[PDB]
Curated annotation (Swiss-Prot), chain A:
It is an enzyme of class 3 (hydrolase). Signal peptide: none annotated. It is found in: Cytoplasm. The gene is yfbR. The keyword DNA-binding does not apply. GO terms for molecular function: 5'-deoxynucleotidase activity; cobalt ion binding; identical protein binding; nucleotide binding; thymidylate 5'-phosphatase activity. Changing D76A: Shows negligible enzymatic activity. HAMAP family: 5DNU. This is 5'-deoxynucleotidase YfbR. The record marks R17 as: Appears to be important in orienting the phosphate for catalysis. It comes from Escherichia coli (strain K12). It comes from the Bacteria. Keywords: Cobalt, Copper, Cytoplasm, Hydrolase, Manganese, Metal-binding, Nucleotide-binding. Homodimer. It catalyses: a 2'-deoxyribonucleoside 5'-phosphate + H2O = a 2'-deoxyribonucleoside + phosphate; dAMP + H2O = 2'-deoxyadenosine + phosphate; dGMP + H2O = 2'-deoxyguanosine + phosphate; dTMP + H2O = thymidine + phosphate.
Amino acid sequence: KQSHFFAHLSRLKLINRWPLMRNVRTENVSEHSLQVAMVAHALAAIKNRKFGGNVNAERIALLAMYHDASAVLTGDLPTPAQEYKAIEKIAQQKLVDMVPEELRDIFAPLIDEHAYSDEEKSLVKQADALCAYLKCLEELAAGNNEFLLAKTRLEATLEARRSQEMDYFMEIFVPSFH
Amino acid sequence: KQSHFFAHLSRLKLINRWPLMRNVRTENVSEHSLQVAMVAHALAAIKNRKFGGNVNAERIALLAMYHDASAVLTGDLPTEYKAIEKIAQQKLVDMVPEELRDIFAPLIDEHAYSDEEKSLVKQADALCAYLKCLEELAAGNNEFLLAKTRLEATLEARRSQEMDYFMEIFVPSFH
Ligand SMILES: Cc1cn([C@H]2C[C@H](O)[C@@H](COP(=O)(O)O)O2)c(=O)[nH]c1=O
Ligand SMILES: Cc1cn([C@H]2C[C@H](O)[C@@H](COP(=O)(O)O)O2)c(=O)[nH]c1=O
Ligand SMILES: [Co+2]
Ligand SMILES: [Co+2]
């Protein structure tokens, strides 16, 4: 019995994001997921280091790697309801069911977003919103105003998900994006 | 002090691999790195679960995420590229805000990998190149034919119980 699990994960790089706008450069889910992982890990390490945190940052990188993994079954759906969130959970679950049985308990808590602690959830949602904001900033620096709307809207999401670790992040790493 | 560190990591997606052949689909360092991290983690976890391992699979993910990070300063270097590499790493480390350097420096420079971790990340890197050959060969691109044959030799030299498990269980779905 062979497993199709990694065969499906290999198609992440095929799934394109932000379909409703002209993109100066088309982002795929695989590039996004690597950036969210790097960002969510950093947010966690900053939290731990500077803000009283006690979160497993390495664990948070791996959850970030897999946070949109079900896109390979569903496709990307641009965030602009309860039903969809439900479909995402079924897709996450079908992916889990592909993992060989003796391995399943390693991967379920990585793919199934029910398994995220409250803190792990906050950090990966903070990373995801930041990454989306960074995408907008790259596009606007490339002279593309189709992302102007989205930037402004993400500025609200980020204040909703505001933390000290995000504030540090925004102050220190974001201005080089402009 | 703002830092250009993440500005530069975001450029991983720009650096293309396998530049000397025709590719049906061009692969970038960012795609590669996520994939090596997924495979390395899997290998680590397999070893632990089936083969008496005691390795930190999450640490191994994180290492693999950053294993080619300096490629943003140098470009893809097709296999003293080791000298160029060491300089780019250090440049990337100098960019990290000082107060956080101890966190990232080991990730970038790769000086503190255990032996096991080196083995697993390097098995993952070879496997990922080998998967890329199968994908290209599946799309009728024979330019990856030699490479596939060579990597079967890289994989044999780096052979492990966990690699064997991975090849038997997950890789047929790619051919
Ligand atoms: C955050 C965000 C994402 N998106 C798009 C990008 C992707 O194509 C898709 C899913 O994004 P996600 O990774 O943030 O959930 O939605 C928007 O269109 N507007 C937004 O504000
Ligand atoms: C492993 C491997 C990589 N490469 C290429 C792909 C990349 O463009 C570059 C570095 O790859 P690496 O991630 O395996 O160090 O070398 C080969 O041409 N042949 C090989 O066997
Ligand atoms: Co996402
Ligand atoms: Co590599």
